[model samples]
Target chain A: GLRDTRPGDTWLADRSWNRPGWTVAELEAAKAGRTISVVLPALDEEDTIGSVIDSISPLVDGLVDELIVLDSGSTDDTEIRAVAAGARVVSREQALPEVPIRPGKGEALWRSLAASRGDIVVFVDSDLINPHPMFVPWLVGPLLTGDGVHLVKSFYRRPGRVTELVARPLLAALRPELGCILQPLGGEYAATRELLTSVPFAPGYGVEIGLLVDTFDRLGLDAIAQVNLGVREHRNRPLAELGAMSRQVIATLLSRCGIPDSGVGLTQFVADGPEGQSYTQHTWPVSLADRPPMQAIRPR
Target chain B: GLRDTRPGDTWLADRSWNRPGWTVAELEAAKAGRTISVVLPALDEEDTIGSVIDSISPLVDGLVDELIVLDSGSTDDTEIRAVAAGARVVSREQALPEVPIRPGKGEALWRSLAASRGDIVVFVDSDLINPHPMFVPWLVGPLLTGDGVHLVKSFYRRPGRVTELVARPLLAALRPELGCILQPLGGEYAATRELLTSVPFAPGYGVEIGLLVDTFDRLGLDAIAQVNLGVREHRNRPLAELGAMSRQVIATLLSRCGIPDSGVGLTQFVADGPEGQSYTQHTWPVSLADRPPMQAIRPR
Candidate 1:
């Protein structure tokens, strides 16, 4: 019946819903029996990388078996700082040496699957200004305790510009059922190795939404759950940057519905500069071509 | 049939649709029998007000019977510059002295009905970076020619931040049928005095969307028409401002549907400054309380 279809039935509104007896210490004690890996896909984010690494370091030895920082060719000190803060840092090309590296958050995430060694995988963003220790435990708790749940997404007070304006509205229109999962495009999420390997990874800004829709499609409602971590704060992108991101999101959504490409591309208005007059031109392609499911690629 | 129901059927794509024979001279010749008033809602828009006034000044005597600039207490030189550019400027309080003045764009627009003497009223925003002469004729052309197009809205290449992110998405979710109207929250529109007096005016940022939905609800689809004004280039607002505007738009939509308010309000995250810590709070109410339709109130 439609009664059980509501998200409130499976939703973990906040940290209070965490298993009563299952504390961080319990997770640490149980770590010996299970293998869990956390991946941080980072670009040129030097400011918050170290702090995020530090926040998760407490669980590295026991609760989380592996801490992999897949740097997407950062010219800044993101890699060095991450390494200094006790994370196993590897560049995009170094992670998957055989294939030609592609530029995108999804590309890095897809490659991290091969780099990680765990039955359960957690993905956390490195650019969070207020990183919390509970973020990892809260995300991973549902996967560990819940019966048939294959994926868990973190929700919080994410009042972001892109998420509010672009992501939420698109979801409401196309996928209203997924609307209950707050912060659908949030970077932090935990999924079983089987689920991660079975789903395709969308390149660039489309990565978060792509995983979300695909997970729901493949695993159904009961297999997915959302956890609320208190509050997440991150650096906000400029409006021009957000425009391109939104286009990528829209393209991913349209492509997912098996709709033919409607010639969707990024068209940004450039202000008058030293070059020439002001003009609006198609800047780049926002294609959401997915990488084959990780299960298809044999681990080296 | 649904063929005419499609937005493309009546949509005038661009300036090319401007009747080749329907020039300013033609409008002037026809003006002897009809009265047309152009209203510009100005608020501290000194930079673009003069050019906007000058663009419509040629038609002031003939095609446009009155060119009125309704100033909303501009602290700048908007009134002085507008008058110098040949626009009769009146403050909001001066327009309706009988009752207490309300704060908002809708208030100025509503009071302008009494301030204006023309049978057909054209409303234009004062802050257009590239104000064109065709803007007036293009918007009012359909009204002059079409049988029952009670309202003509100006739609153009509006590459603004808010229009793309906030307004478009809300329209898609709430009023998908109105989706065909390209610029749902576009500031410029022309309506017959009969329609203007009959419809309720939403107080603030909700003014544009309120008009669109109410007009559609009261008078069927055929009564409305959209004209393509080439490219509307205006000042891009910061993200914070757009958030407040989107809230008001959403509020307006919900209220118009007679849906009970689900406690939707503006919750802005203010960055930390010399004034204590960062906080997220409901800063303002985004209510869309409409002033009663002008027909209900007797003009003093």
Candidate 2:
């Protein structure tokens, strides 16, 4: 059954977690005396770190209790710049000594969720050219104002045609109820501690998209809402970079959703057996394609 | 005066290049005696390399004498996979020894042109998950059929709203004549060997957009055409990743044509001479925003 989203839904949408917007009033209400933290996951970003910290510190000084940066072995002056920008920078390896450091933006995000000192954590990327002051507040506004909300995420009508045209339509057709919502794989989001701890995190391109669907699947669709950011002039990727991203998203979507293989499915199975006796089930490279309309589903 | 592009004026419309009721016959006739080569620039793309090579090879096997992969230092056994998939692999360093080994998709592409053997060369990114077999044939169809066509580029409806709304509008406003064209930065394209060698390739996010403006300037608008690839499944980048891309693109755009600083025209700079004398000059970031609409040249 399709779930129609109505007005007055709690929404949270931002490009990143740090650049202002979450006000003292909203934080006071949402936290109810509890501390709120902002986690920044970064690589070698020396150029923009000062500006990011300058933009974010005032908000932290007034509203946020702790500002944290999870560093991923950046070769440049990322550590000095982040620290100089007034963020408490910590090496990712130090935080998760048990787990080997895997190179992925999503991995940084997942680790930040566990390490940060906040009841509600916000993860923002460090490379924004124009970090809006209202970004954080607008993103977290919905969750603070509501009851039945367990998760909040951000979506912008920025330069992402593929998300709207390709990902949304495909997701809608495959999972209509989940598809009606705009910006499913939006990177900027706000969520409760409970949801973060319970839900599994995908450590690649699949991270943002996988998290959105997983959250919705676990916590009903009514709990989610998207916000409109006027415009963001950050960056655009070439086809090759986007290709790697697509594979990860598709793989995560298939693995998490448990969809049965159809004709278009790209599936491979490896067998280690004596004659016909198989040992284990291993799924390799799952393929999913957008099928025809619902009418075809009924007849064929 | 703008020339009307009627059906008979050009050999190919927006249909299959080798099918009935399209330009396949004309295309075949044009390329009857000429050799064509297709280049696929590959990075760490072991997962989808086999399928992509298999699909594209059959379409251009007879038409294109050689299909090659110009490889960057791919960690994921990309060379092995490409060889298995029937593509001749050439190391980027070996191809362009003059250019320092820079880590970028564009660098690989630039090197591929120098090493290629055909009179007409087509380029496709190696990471396409479901590459349609007709990509090369369709891209090359126009160039083969039409005289004085130095370049043929491909554009598709990107499945993204940000691309359509934000990027497209900015692109259109900056370069209005180019606004109507879909997928300006689309990596898939077919070009003559003469044109490919002349242009300088920017090393990263700026390559595709930079190429469009550069080629259009050199070859004129009529020479460029777009072909739709239906729906492509590429990865979505993180905000941080996008920030880096934006910088590269902005740098490329500015360097190629240069975006004149808003409200600052005909400005001059003065420098001190060795003997306490002064000199005047002008320097710009070369930030290239597409030039304003050509139609704007005439009064309304």
Candidate 3:
């Protein structure tokens, strides 16, 4: 009674491909006259930001025009590491000094469009481990050899359990048409500044799915494509920490579905007792606000 | 700012107790004219049903009047073993014949209420591993000498990661007052047939969280109490199975918040690819309907 065939299957065949499908020359040829910007929006990522930047250095001159790192408030040496590893660094405060700044990747990336301009933008999460040479090339391949494709997301060993557990289920239930596209919550991907400016970014970690769903809503599923990045490796977070990601990711999907959570503090319990036999509860506030469509501010 | 002290904290001190708090002699004295029924609702529980009944046999006649196993549908030897271990086994189709039948823990439990009568009913999940002689004694402790307290739930080594992950987070967000609750989704608990009948039962595993929330809404916090049962062990389902559980449980909580899930088919995806690189989606039906308050059908 159960068969896994659908429109997404068509999408997988027509749009999806391996990371190394095109070499730098092939990607550059497809890139004809298309300016490219690779953005690494980071905060307190001093430990790995340097290595992350070096991984993308290969794309800087030939395939990418700008290797930009927008720092949204890092109390550490993130700027130093990003620059040392070869890139231009912009601070969140400097990007839109008059409009004001906020926390999270979406906010940082949204502000980057103000300080820097590139027709196409790539977002690479600095937390990535063992990012390969073609990570950047693959993410933008569909966007370049593209088919009205406004967004191209990354897929790895599997869209992490977070995506599988929280994001995909909600997406499948609410927008099952998007089911063929994996990694709804994936952070690494590329998009046109035109489309990026057109849609709103969910402040913080919710930016990924928020953008994908928003794109599907704005341009339909055909505009969205996912590429096989072979394996986008990254460190795993504690399961407890993933709950907040799940909460925010969940809130993002629900809001898009027209049933927004009216801003509830994400509360959780800790196993506290002898042998952790019992529990003690605690909560922290989580914001669900979305940044306005960048196009509204910067008419593109 | 995150201190785990609330009305629930006060409740833990005022009402909660450890299992074996009272000897059978003490419990008999406290029981004083009260009737008791310990119920284990089963379907395909052959491996554990016999041992489950033996665990509760010590309280038969002395503290528990009816040791009932409401066998919904077990193609296996669930009924044989339950009976062989000294208890009466009732079938689901046999009870509530005049009314239509449904599936899930709630339906089985709801049907159980129709066929058996007890001033106090204790539910022990037959899947429980190493159930102690005191599990029933403890679950019914408050009910015996109870005041307005109509529901008493069990807490073990911990309220399981499922409660910690999905249930508690939602409870703390939508109903922060319930923050102190360890396992809002715990299955093993006892209630006055009085309260059980007054509240509608959500059909399925959603029953545990559904009942607790309903009890809170109808009778308020003072009407509920929980006891420490030391530890409860059960076979863990694959994480995939828990997704459906989370989906159902989430639907239950969201419904009470007045923002119901409009009958989503509970779609999920299977990771399908070389090294499981991508996904294919599939869905199975899930019902979110609730049976009406049992109290309306009976006058006890």
Candidate 4:
């Protein structure tokens, strides 16, 4: 059954649950005894990365102790522009030279723990068209002010085709308990360093959903909170690419529930004009592959 | 842009298009020396066949002129029940003896033209729980009375999982012109023998969508009308069955648009528990294999 927020669970609604009184000054005061690091996990996001970094530069020392850009092999000028905007940028290969590097947003986010020193980490996508300075404070406020709240996920008006058509129906069918979590695949979220280090990181598009389910399992509903970020306008993915992304998400969800993998492949036929038909085959591996708790990895 | 019904396009909306005066008396008056045939295309539908056939028995002579049950190789007592309830039952093999028969609803529908003698043909599913005598006059009302309208499709409240999740979005994306068709996959419809004999019918689940698109192309929107059948309650299909049904629908849609088939296959992986992962591959054929319009198939 699909569950909506109840009156007893008024605290779960992102619209009214956010820290309205916690401003930049309040965030700085709360960060006096602890370090907060903001990481932008980017992949070929040259257009908006610089502006995104510039928005949060004013609170670099006041609220955010460190701002790092973890580039997952971006072929564009994301690294150069990110560095020029007054932030430390590192490629996937440059972080943890001893451990083998993987290629995904989750891989970069996980590796950022080794690259930066912060007690609390906030992760955001670099492709936001309207990056605000308040995104950091809003995400980190709950972790700073609310006791036992280990993670804060962002909620907003999502007009994307994939979320509306694929993710929502799938959630309603398989994971009805998690149906209350709006924007399960939303890239913006903040977690305590301890929580981040304890959970395994799923490889690809499945990362967001994987983390959500895992967080809910480890920490009960009270430990999780959502902040209404108002609206997020970003690059829209092509409908063709959504199939692969959905496969990854489905695989991650199934794997997390301890459901063994069935090796079913999806074949899509496309009309190739006079050249005959061309088909693409998509197969999800039995295991999505995960990285153990980052706390287990001691710095060299 | 998504088009809504216009003033002249009142025929497209089922709510207003159905005739309040078009009862058996009106249908008999409008018959004007032409014969009408109502065909129930069935397969192993013994449970509801008797009730469905009994409901339409009143219109057999006065309005319908003839009633037929085109059986598609049913193993159950569907034929026995339908025959007992007063239908001129004909098996797939007996319909068109000279031509080799195929295994699909479209095959039965296409062949039914040769088996029964009528100027206009009406098709209704045999598994309907609320079959009524009004179904005959309502579907054939426009074809017999309205000017330039040659086909009448049925529209009703379809709470099926397949229609809501898969069919509607796909229609909105690829065929926006046909998007306003409330129930594109509905089985109940009526067409003049000329129109039915002129358009190719797609095999399997593609039949309904195929006919709608083909009719829209051949006869134009102005020639089509929809009759509100009120509410139709029948056996709901399982969610697992929808995938195959959806694949057929998509394949038929792409083929009809003159888009060359791209040999794309979808592979789905399911967990096999102790056995690890098992995968199933789904491939869409280049074309949905349609029969030449009945006009081309000369009567023996």
Candidate 5:
């Protein structure tokens, strides 16, 4: 049953280790003099934003330095709930006032770097089903304890099909060093502020993948590790939306691999009539334009 | 409900039309003394080879000139069953003794050109659920009647998810002009001997996609058309096998686009434990090597 193994096989053993059973006390001790910032990027997640903040705000004094919710022009009550749950709501325009606010997860992630002051930055999606109390500490655990681990990614039972089907296969082909990573496009991850701000954030759904790839390229494989966040429950998406996500991912991947971009738009086939007796084809661009690195803007 | 349209929309209206209902007599009249060869490429389809061959063998004298099945080293009773159903089984080794026989649909396809001598060539998959009586004629009908139409693709109501999920998206990005094609990877299609032998055959599962692409690239947009074959049913594959298909298609597409190939191996995740408590990665190369064109093999 054994087939060809990846280049990441040996690299994976040295990189990814440890389950997430560490107490808050152990992580707080590991923090020592280092500061931690937990940032949540929410656009329209009003329903689950409050409890997600609630899970992290309690650990602000010891483990988490600041809990900032970077709202990317959310029309929902996400801003209200995030603020009410002990989070400083940082709007997109508020952090990066030089340029106009754009719509994407990466914009919020980029803005969070300017808004918060922490050596170690932890990012979590605001629309999670239920945010466990230990999620923040677990992601930060590697950064705090491990020797020079620049990034820590969360791995769980089941995540987005986009993670498995689209991102995983693409990573396998392009970045075999990152192949052992269970969730390449996963939302929950932690990285050093220097590492996050230094690289260019793909100003779209490609935030997580671009982050992981740049980490692998800039630093060695030992700079990355994955923490087993045993039971990660989060938002689910429709099938059509997942196609759009795949488009963003493919664009970022090809760009990072130095593949010239052509054919930016992706076409999807939809049933034109009931019972799928008739069909119509539609083409639209989903590979959103990427933004410049945060370092470029703040050159001082 | 409206979105961006493709470059193929105006081109599609002119190309893809008509539900297949033409009789064997009508296609014979449309033939106008043009010899037709129906080819079925079988590898290990022992169970469903007979009925498919039976569907086309009856039209041998009226519309079809030759009915050949290029058997690609089947380990089962595929050759016997095909022969029993009135098919001249041309084994892969016999067709092209100059080169070694490889295991793929395209190798069989490339070999079929040497085995059968017909002006108009119609290819059908031997593993079809129930080959319709009009399938061969419908594929050949447009090539027979339409002026300057070099290739005809059979587009049914329902088909493989790989057609929609993997092949469709990749085509949408790289070959947007081919976006309106209902089934780019549909096994049932027809082309002329001059058109078939001119281009390189990706000696792998990428046979269908590569053929369609070459037809679109070599001949103009008007040279290609899709016939509406209602209600197509075929053998279903497991989910894992579909990933392998995606790899071949992606490889062929990038190669055609002049993108240098590096990462041919694809990685897939398998559960190490019973309940997926642990997982391991497996990487294997799915894209088989390509063979030179039939024209290169037979220069005279």
Candidate 6:
């Protein structure tokens, strides 16, 4: 159990005191006048979205100032539901119109920066079943008081049999800092609006991992912090679906990290079909996806 | 408009009558007696998996020898239903003992190669709404007439909003030979058992993309072909759920393609809550939970 943080607690004075690069006195100075906006990007998530909005929106509203839900063309009444549950709803497409509206969470999140009215912003996945309000307080509480802290990551209890076995181990071996994160891909996180505006969004499965890596690149190791949200029960994709998702994450990391391309080494990709070996083919090109600022599309 | 390939037209016949590879006459003379198997890996997809089983089972059963469904721990009676639909169902865990059972299409496919009793194995996703009887034939036809053709690919019309807007362009950019193919990630293909056993199975979103790249490296560009399946519909994941999916795909490509990593750079990440910087303290270990092989552990 941990002590509940209040207005009087000095920044970095609590448990995070051990981490280097931050001091309690410097954090207390930064905490004087800050505003934050928490955004829950949604689509047909009426079941869990309401509870999530209920849980964190109030905390951000009380401690910070604004709360909004960026709705990405949901076929379900997610817009109506989110608005009824006391959130400012904005269409995802409205945030970024120059690029074609892609059906992805990254696209929606990229748009949230344009629509949100706050100095800092937090994004939470809409599918979580158990939402702890402390998610916002714990995550951002560090950033509020500390001088160099820039990103706030969240931790949660994973809900599937496969994540524990497959994804966790893979991440542990590949990305150690990510292994420390309870759910590196856990879609719930808080950040400053400035940071959200600077990074490029990968448009699909690459969003969460991309953000984590990108954030680390921009702010250094000292800027990152993770908040525990207890247990969260979001939907888990089947194994087949997971195969596709893993590909995206790997692709994003390689491209972003400026990895050299050596097409014939440890891994070899193939397309197999009925025709023996006669019909297979391959194509390659430069990776270039433009992520322009959302304000560029906005009417003055 | 592309010529509509039909029955008895020898679908394997090169569209350009004078292509350089082996003619149909040569293929038949070299390898006439080999048997092939087609496997459909499925989950709770009671809705569309049936149509797929019905369409391909008969075509491949008569032309090849076996049609199998490697079950990946489905709870919705998917195995019984698949068996009732006349598919030979085998538990996915029975085949691969070295790897733990993870939620991924790759695991099912890797295991299916072990269970299949044929020189060639064709895998078609069970989620397609319209499983054209011709899909199996189109994929398999190349194998019968082409020399050393070890793999076959399928492309179809994507009717969903997200697939068209988001998934397609990203796919095209990453894989241009697949640019002509409508759904490169479409989980429908055929391959020789020899090739399947040798290639590594990427656990999650990594599977299909990994296959494409792996097959290309092993057989070169000409060994794979993408056949058109006209139109297919099944289900689309929610926009939010797509975040992890995209990450998985990127990761698969990065690891498989031997793309070198860019040294980590520092930029700004996000921090919400206070005026300057917030700090929350928590203590945890840098540990990861890994799954043991399914065959080693009996089900509880």
Q: What's the lDDT for all of these models? A: 0.73, 0.57, 0.74, 0.69, 0.75, 0.58
| TM per candidate | 0.61, 0.44, 0.87, 0.52, 0.88, 0.50
lDDT of 5 by residue, B147-238 (tens): 78888876665545566556766676667788767788888888999999888898577889988888888776788877656567777766
User: Regarding lDDT, does 2 or 5 come out ahead?
Assistant: 5
Q: Model 6, range B55-89, lDDT digits (tens) per residue? A: 86655435647888887778887787787888888
Checking candidate 5 for backbone clashes, the offending pairs are none
Residues A1-300, model 1: lDDT tens digits: 111121112254231233334778886665557789999999999999999999999887778889999999899999889989999998877877888887788899999998887899999999888777888887887777746778888665543666765665455445656655657788989988888888889888889889889988876766777765655777776656776676677667657756443444544434333222222433555665788898888442
> What lDDT is reached at residue A264 by model 4?
34
Question: Which ranges of candidate 4 are over 4 A from the true structure?
Answer: A1-300, B1-10, B13-19, B263-270, B273-287
What lDDT is reached at residue B227 by model 4?
Answer: 68
Badly placed stretches (over 4 Å) of model 6 are A1-146, A149-215, A224-256, A260-300, B1-31, B93-103, B160-181, B237-241, B259-300
What is the lDDT for A28 in model 1? 69
Worst-scoring 10-residue span by lDDT in model 6 chain B: B261-270
Q: What TM-score describes the B chain of model 5?
A: 0.90
* Model 1: lDDT of residue A150: 84
User: Which tens-of-lDDT digit does each residue in B95-147 have in candidate 2?
Assistant: 76754666666667777776777888888887777776777777777677654
lDDT of 3 by residue, A1-300 (tens): 013222111133344433345667887988879899988888888988888888889777789888999898988999988888898999988877878777667789889888678899998888888777778877777788756888887666643556655566556456767766667877788899888888788877688889998998888877877765654567666666766776677667777877756577666656565444445565655667898887787665
The weakest ten consecutive residues by lDDT in model 2 chain B span: B1-10
Candidate 6's docking class is: incorrect
Query: Cα lDDT for residue A103, model 4?
Result: 68
Alpha-carbon lDDT of model 6: 0.58
The candidate, 4 or 6, that scores higher on lDDT is 4
**Count of clashing residue pairs in every prediction:** 0, 33, 0, 35, 0, 105
User: List-wise, what DockQ does each model earn?
Assistant: 0.07, 0.02, 0.31, 0.03, 0.31, 0.04
Q: Give me the candidate number with maximum TM-score.
A: 5
> C-alpha displacement of A197 in model 1, angstroms?
0.9
